[PDB]
């Protein structure tokens, strides 16, 4: 945290093109549930999977 | 370690042995830092 009044500037671009710029803007998005649990019928952690 | 709690008990006429398959993964708590280059790969000459 901290960094009071550090006036950061990075993403400013000197060219008319978008791909000339510098990464990132980051991303915090995740969706593990599509790779880890890609099943039709949802299964709870309490219940046994197969009944 | 993986120990026998009781025993692998099987009726007559059935195979006398089986196989466990083990798998591994991470939980929501898992993280990493200071990215580097792996040790598994080796190269000698430029791939043609």
């Amino acid at each position: 945290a901290t960094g009071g009044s550090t006036i950061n500037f990075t993403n400013i671009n000197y060219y008319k093109d978008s791909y000339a710029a510098s990464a990132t803007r980051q991303d915090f998005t995740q969706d593990p549930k599509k790779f880890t649990q890609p099943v039709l019928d949802s299964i709870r952690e309490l219940s046994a999977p197969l009944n | 370690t993986l120990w026998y709690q009781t025993n692998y008990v099987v009726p007559p006429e059935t195979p006398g042995e089986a196989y466990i398959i083990a798998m591994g993964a991470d939980l929501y708590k898992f993280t990493l830092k200071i990215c580097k280059d792996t040790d598994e790969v080796t190269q000698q000459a430029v791939l043609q």
């Binding site: - | 993986l2 026998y4 798998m23 591994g24 991470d26």
Partner: protein, 96 residues
């Protein structure tokens, strides 16, 4: 994602039987079966797991691992096992 720990990684394990843990009816009760170190970025059965490859591009790791065991028997095969985890310390436990 769960991928397959290669616990039988030893020699004379042929090609694909390296992934299997043999279970049969014992004689002396209270027997050991298989053992592996927990370090996912270390040489051993974790070297074949996806999580073992990605933690190997990084210098450090933190978190909880998970180890899933799937028994392929006949429907008629029954049994119980004890899957134990011992934090750092004296070497591999000698007894159950």
């Amino acid at each position: 994602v769960e991928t397959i720990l290669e616990v039988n990684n030893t020699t004379e394990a042929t090609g694909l039987t390296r992934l299997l843990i043999p279970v049969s009816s014992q004689n002396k009760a209270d027997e050991l079966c298989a053992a592996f170190m927990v370090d996912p970025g270390r040489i051993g059965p974790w070297q074949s797991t996806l999580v073992g490859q990605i933690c190997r591009y990084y210098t450090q790791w933190s978190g909880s691992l998970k180890v899933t065991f799937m028994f392929t028997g006949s429907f008629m095969a029954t049994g119980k096992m004890l899957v134990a985890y011992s934090p750092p310390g004296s070497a591999q436990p000698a007894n159950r």
